[PDB]
Ligand binder design. Structure first.
Ligand SMILES: O=C(O)/C=C/C(=O)O
Ligand SMILES: O=C(O)/C=C/C(=O)O
Ligand code: SF4
Ligand code: SF4
Lengths: 69, 37, 857, 857, 69, 37
């Protein structure tokens, strides 16, 4: 449950999560940046839907540009 | 007069029907068929 | 009454002895004989929609609004989509939502508006034409919605697209319809030769499956490594056209089947007679199968043909006409039904009845055409011209028992429309010729007669100019029909003419002549500059100067005539796609092209109308002003500007000057040059969209009346506003004083640079209805053919009867006469027009005439 | 510090003795020297609009709505009109109604949105891009209107037009930007090479007068007897285009002059200092004359150039870039002003100041580009790449005093944009080379260096494929610039690249490699099928099987890459006409064609990015799995799916396998084939819209970061989500262990089937800033040139300083570094990206290195 | 004054006259059929504007088709 | 601030004027010119 999973009408959508940044082409999609490796990798996961997806690592907020790719 | 469109018809859509009425004037008798919902 | 010929005394007593004593002034009220009780009923209650003088004859005929409404709804919804698909979506919405109509006693069913008294309108074409309807008593309703619709379409209309590419002054001149017919983009008027053969043989389901296959292959092509952008992008327009074809065809099938379902519903819920109930279910089944599937019998074919006609001529787009080779088209189906009895078994007389019903449906087909075109076909609904006879691919007789069924039905039911063209060859069987004559001797005015070989040769010549080298093959060149009244075109599954922009539209020499004598200024009708300033009166110092002024007037006018058509063509294929017509053309389907874009068989022509007025005027000018110097041009011009008032002696001089149609050397030498060097010679210098020449098709329809009324007095002796000549090459009414064979001799002299020329002739009733009628007529046609004359058509009607029909129209409802290229109900023609027909010389044959024709009794 | 070379001891002490004791970690905060008080002021208050990670760095930067609003208003009003004219009307409405901006201290004036903190948006391009803006903190306002606007445009958008011609699954794959860059029609991203030369030389009034003449002649052609419909219809599209040019040019002039009037108004009503008042009136006068009239001096030319830039890159349409040959373009005007003093007399230093102001205006140019393109250029506004140097038509030195003015301005003002490309030839004067080095040694990252002869030859080769046989002449082939970062294109009055659809856009070998090992399935980022099913792991029984699997993945991807561009091209010229750009192209003007329709010089290319990750992975697979059989593919694949967790010994094995950039035979033999046979060889099989080949331009911009983050672990030793290689042909960061000349030797091996390849290198600060710096660098470049290498560009920056700038960004505002093909403000780069630059190997030169370079001290 | 002449806002426009019939192409224009000759000619005059033109022969009404061309 | 468009200007239309206002923020001073009626 620490990986993105569907949860219809969730109180904690990917969209509001600090780890999420929108897809480069389609703003309906998202990018999960939560999987950050000790050697510096930001191992993204593609989000088909940011309104009805969530996981346990969800944390409301917004990272500055410095902490994104 | 209300006639539901046969569900296997090319123009079938849910709730669709032919409204059919008879008319007659100086020339003669005829029937009109208009699709409705 | 009696004539002596080769030592015999010929007696011109009627074949039916009863007619010896039937008063001359009511003859045609005795001749109809509908083949069945049903078709008798159908005629008696026929919903005629004749128009004259710009209006409909009957108050009950009025415009529909459904087509306007649903086309508009689709157009708004389809914004952004490819234009070809948008057009398909428009047609589909119209077909999906249209009220359909079924009438009592009908077997062939279907209609093109929401009520049997109505007709649809066309806001996508001419915004002016729609506005004219809104200002009329027969406006679509509700008027406010209709007005709102027209305002929506105006910036998108074909008219609005084409006008910016022309000098506003030039359009104003054309729009007057005085020296030039208005361009089709301004009126919405149009024509078409539908590939009926494809629908009947293949059915629409097959066309759909075929387009879908093309699409899949094209999409596969586009994803194949390695991509080539100089080739692969060609698939875009192709896929658009094919997807549009599928949308259009599926909608047509759905529409046909919904018509079928109305038959079923009426049979089961409304009709109380078990006989009619069974028939209605029979019709319902046909509509279910057809045109989705290939036709199997004659009933199938007739209904398939009617459905195709409605889409091509009324619903997808307006098009005048009924072009088709009906005997050759229906023969395989006649054979299956009547001869082999393999499907829908029928008697020959059953076939005859079915054709009668077709004639009656067409008689009910009201046309949503613009004011001009409600002016120029008086006494009819519209132009509907079908073709029969001629020769097959091997040059042998194409006549058959289906031909005879079509002709007999015409003779029996006596409807003014559809008109018939008979392609005459020495190959044609006498049995069928006799049926042709039965129609003519009854005064129907049709079949008109076309020279088979001239037309076939013509098709071969045009074929050479094909832009993709796929013009008519030599064998295919035998497959031709008249498009509207007069001009040949290919029929079949491919290469047919898709639009009037290819060929059609008129030009008016009489008006051009008038303004030639006034430095291009029209003082008499519009009071404005109508042509180029080709020289004032004093500059016209010789006959050659007059000749050249007309030439320049003609060149200016004809250039506009063709260029406006080609510009229309440019935009039609881009914004007025016809995906249904495209889907049933084998070439369009194969190449993924729109019907207006692809042009495999060139067929360029334009119509000189009021030619002989111009020609007689020139002859008289030469003789009296320049040769004899009896009058100066200033004297003539002063006389003309006075409408000859005070100058009657001058008028009579010009009137009696030599005239076309008298086998007179002086007149004919000048006029022959006029046809060949100017009318044809100059026009032929122009090349149209299709890459072939443009040649003249002389005719007149009702324009010889309307243009006459817009033309001032002319040196042939006309007063201002009098009618012009009635044909392309007819003598001016009442000026042929040397008999019928003198006329043939004049006409035969015009041989170069023509596409065709309409000849009206009127023959003595007693002779034609006598037992000698057929022999004399058959000899006439043989002689006419040997003289290499393009066309002839006949009135056979007493003046007494026409005058009687003027006094008491209600007693002469079945009087039909020939106008020009089409026939009409005489009592539905305005008095002005009626008088021009009465004035046509009724020809008698002298013994020298009969000898010239090599008649044998 | 000290090196022994050819019996000398080289001392690497800095040229400025003061630098001996300046801490290494703050060096670049000491180097700016704006030439005037004004440009110092302008820099300090500069309205930077840098974007990183998909967002703008500063909260004050936000979207405008005026362009959206006025484009929409025009589009609704122009329904029915020809599309080219609709586009001209759109631009005109935007220009006529736009709020204009004047800022204090400016001399070059003008802007592209309604407020200096803003930028315009583009609803006509990508509806998704606009929607992304609406969901952002920098949405246009009012949000409800903007939303309504986007809904209006969606069915009309370029995106909506192109999508129906591709399998949706394919679009979904591209839109992820993992194996393929999204097509331009989906993002709105774009580029252009404006024909600046035409505007500066002729002025717009002349272009207007010229189009009007073409129109008059065309209309005359159409009314000439005898009409030919196979020719005369060609005039329609021409007249539409020319009329559109006139509308566009008139609007631009009016817009320029209204800008001038704002200068006048501020001078007379707002500005209180008589010095500035006089200057504002000077500017007002320039704007009145320019660009209506030909430019006469350098101030004219600069303002003309900026105005043209705004229309072509921001207002008529969005386009990335700043492509132009600035020294050659401005030279005639520099000469007139500075040398001859004939008009707008100026000193060389005055010219230097004017260029500084230009750099500052560009530094304020915010770009309304989509989210992806706010991701992949971190630390900059956008790509702005200008070109200088090279050779003239005779092959002689093109360098001049204007070149030097441009370079000095860059060195002085220290802005990250615009970046500079220097075309290097042995012809180039040392005086100018020294200025190039001054910029590089100061760590600016530019000028990058392009091989002059390779590019010129390239132009000649492409010219051969011209569809109308009017490609670059041999002399014209010397007139070239980089379009964006890396790819050569013609500059001048004609034949320039008008759209990114011709060439540009990227493809990502690393991701293609990853899914090659998983039967086309992307398990690591998107969890879905991303490519064709090229074979499961067990089917990959040899290295050749692995090689072929990648090939098919690559073939599938590159086909989509080019075809989506060519389809965009098809619709751009049909619905996204650029009448202004057309008006200033000599070919477009002459032929009456739209800028996107006419393509006289082919220039097809696509960008392989993340190539070396793919290449190193393949090398490691061959050696360890198939040659030595130390691991099976199943063992590798299990390790990869684990992100190497538990498999660190395996990872280290693959990491230490032979790597690109070490002049190692094993690695380089495989990788050379990879570049030449697959990357270039397969791509070159494709032909684009323009009829030429498509060849690869290897580069990276910030995509090597973004794609890296979307790519799982790979057999080169990466963990999932780590950065890819930084260039087109750079060694992967930290894997080049043999020094700088070893790198050159590796890189030089790739010679076939390339259009270009970006090489990033990083040189030791002490050496470069020593008195021996120029000689070693000049020797490096000479050697690089002899080895026939396409490109090289340099970072010159200590790790100490970059780390300091991470800890304390507010103390390191003037630190500029090279990313890939562009330079950036380091503190505006995200940490992830910063670390990739720090990890790039700082190269020292051994005495053997120096001997290899044939250095002479 | 028995010939068509301009008369702005006339109570007796061509449009309502029985002798007028609309132009074949443009319904803003008209056809005057008043000049009828004894030999049968209907010598029409073109009307540029049917709202602001009139003459003395003006007669409100409508002719049937029989009496038009 | 309201400035009527010079009647000989390319963009002159009756009643047209430039509305000009001065603004200043953290970065600096500037002027905006918007056409009005
Ligand atoms: O379309 C026309 O004008 C005429 C056609 C014809 O007479 O066939
Ligand atoms: O358009 C591109 O993406 C590539 C540009 C370049 O490197 O020149
Ligand atoms: S909620 Fe979970 S899956 Fe969604 S963005 Fe945040 S960490 Fe990723
Ligand atoms: S008012 Fe006079 S000019 Fe007008 S239509 Fe009637 S008669 Fe003709």
């Amino acid at each position: 449950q620490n990986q993105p999973h569907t949860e219809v009408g969730t109180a904690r959508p990917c969209r509001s999560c600090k780890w999420q940044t929108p897809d480069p082409t389609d703003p309906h999609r998202g990018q999960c940046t939560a999987n950050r490796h000790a050697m510096g990798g930001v191992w993204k996961r593609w989000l088909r839907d940011v309104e009805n997806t969530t996981c346990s690592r969800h944390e409301e907020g917004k990272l500055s540009f410095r902490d994104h790719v | 007069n209300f006639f539901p469109v046969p569900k296997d018809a090319d123009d079938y859509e849910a709730g669709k029907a032919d409204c059919v009425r008879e008319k007659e004037d100086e020339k003669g008798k005829y029937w009109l068929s208009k699709p409705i919902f | 009454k009696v004539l002596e010929y080769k030592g015999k005394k010929l007696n011109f007593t009627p074949e039916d002895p009863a007619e010896e004593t039937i008063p001359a002034d009511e003859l045609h009220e005795h001749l109809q004989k509908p083949s069945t009780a049903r078709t008798k009923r159908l005629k008696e209650r026929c919903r005629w929609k004749h128009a004259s003088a710009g209006e409909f004859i009957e108050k009950s005929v009025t415009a529909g609004i459904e087509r306007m409404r649903y086309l508009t709804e689709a157009h708004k919804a389809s914004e952004g989509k490819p234009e070809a698909i948008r057009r398909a979506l428009g047609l589909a919405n119209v077909l999906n939502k249209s009220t359909l109509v079924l009438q009592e006693d009908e077997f062939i069913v279907g209609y093109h508006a929401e009520d049997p008294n109505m007709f649809p309108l066309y806001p996508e074409l001419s915004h002016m034409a729609v506005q004219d309807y809104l200002r009329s008593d027969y406006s679509p309703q509700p008027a406010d919605e209709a007005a709102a619709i027209n305002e929506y379409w105006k910036p998108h209309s074909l008219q609005s697209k084409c006008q910016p590419y022309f000098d506003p002054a030039d359009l104003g001149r054309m729009y007057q319809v005085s020296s030039m017919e208005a361009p089709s983009f301004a009126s919405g008027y149009n024509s078409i030769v539908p590939p009926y053969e494809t629908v009947l043989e293949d059915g629409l389901l097959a066309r759909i499956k075929l387009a879908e296959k093309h699409i899949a292959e094209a999409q596969a092509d586009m994803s194949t490594f390695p991509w080539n952008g100089t080739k692969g992008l060609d698939n875009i327009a192709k896929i658009d056209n094919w997807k549009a074809m599928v949308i259009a065809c599926k909608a047509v099938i759905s529409w046909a089947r919904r018509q079928g379902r109305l038959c079923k519903i009426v049979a089961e819920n409304f009709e109380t007679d078990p006989k009619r109930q069974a028939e209605l279910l029979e019709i319902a089944d046909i509509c279910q199968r057809i045109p989705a599937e290939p036709c199997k019998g004659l009933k199938d074919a007739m209904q398939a043909k009617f459905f195709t006609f409605l889409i091509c001529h009324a619903i997808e787009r307006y098009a005048s006409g009924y072009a088709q080779k009906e005997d050759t088209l229906l023969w395989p189906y006649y054979k299956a039904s009547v001869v082999d009895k393999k499907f829908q078994p029928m008697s020959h007389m059953d076939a005859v009845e079915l054709v009668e019903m077709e004639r009656l449906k067409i008689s009910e087909h009201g046309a949503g055409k613009s004011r001009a075109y409600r002016e120029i076909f008086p006494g009819s609904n519209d132009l509907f011209i079908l073709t029969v006879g001629g020769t097959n691919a091997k040059g042998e007789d194409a006549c058959n028992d289906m031909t005879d069924a079509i002709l007999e039905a015409a003779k029996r039911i006596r409807t003014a429309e559809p008109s018939i063209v008979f392609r005459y060859s020495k190959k044609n069987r006498e049995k069928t010729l006799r049926w042709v004559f039965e129609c003519i001797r009854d005064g129907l005015g049709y079949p008109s007669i076309k020279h088979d070989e001239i037309g076939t040769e013509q098709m071969k010549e045009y074929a050479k100019f094909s832009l993709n080298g796929n013009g008519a093959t030599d064998e295919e060149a035998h497959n031709w029909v008249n498009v509207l009244c007069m001009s040949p075109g290919i029929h079949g599954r491919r290469k047919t003419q898709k639009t009037r922009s290819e060929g059609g539209g008129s030009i008016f020499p009489a008006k051009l002549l008038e303004i030639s004598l006034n430095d291009g200024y029209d003082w008499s009708y519009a009071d404005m500059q109508l042509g180029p300033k080709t020289g004032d009166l004093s500059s016209l110092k010789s006959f050659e100067d007059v000749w050249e002024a007309f030439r320049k007037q003609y060149q200016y006018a004809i250039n506009l005539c063709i260029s406006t058509k080609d510009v229309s063509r440019y935009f039609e294929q881009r914004f007025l796609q016809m995906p249904f017509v495209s889907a049933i053309d084998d070439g369009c389907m194969e190449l993924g092209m729109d019907a207006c874009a692809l042009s495999e068989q060139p067929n360029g022509w334009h119509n000189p109308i009021t030619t002989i007025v111009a020609a007689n005027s020139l002859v008289a000018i030469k003789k009296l002003v320049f040769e004899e110097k009896k009058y100066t041009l200033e004297q003539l011009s002063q006389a003309l500007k006075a409408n000859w008032e005070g100058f009657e002696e001058m008028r009579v001089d010009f009137k009696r000057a030599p005239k076309w149609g008298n086998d007179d050397d002086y007149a004919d030498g000048i006029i022959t040059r006029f046809y060949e060097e100017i009318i044809g010679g100059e026009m032929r210098k122009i090349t149209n969209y299709s890459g072939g020449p443009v040649m003249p098709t002389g005719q007149a329809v009702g324009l010889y009346m309307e243009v006459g009324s817009r033309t001032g007095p002319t040196p042939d002796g006309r007063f201002g506003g009098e009618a012009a000549d009635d044909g392309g090459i007819s003598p001016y009414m009442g000026t042929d004083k040397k008999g019928p064979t003198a006329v043939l001799r004049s006409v035969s002299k015009v041989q170069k640079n023509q596409k065709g020329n309409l000849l009206n002739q009127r023959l003595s009733v007693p002779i034609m209805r006598s037992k000698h009628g057929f022999e004399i007529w058959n000899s006439y046609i043989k002689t006419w053919h040997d003289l290499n004359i393009d066309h002839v058509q006949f009135n056979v009607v007493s003046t007494d009867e026409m005058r009687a029909a003027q006094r008491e129209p209600e007693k002469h409802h079945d009087l039909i006469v020939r106008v020009s290229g089409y026939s009409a109900r005489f009592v539905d023609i305005p008095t002005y027009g009626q008088n021009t027909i009465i004035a046509r010389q009724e020809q008698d044959f002298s013994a020298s005439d009969l000898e010239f024709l090599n008649v044998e009794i």
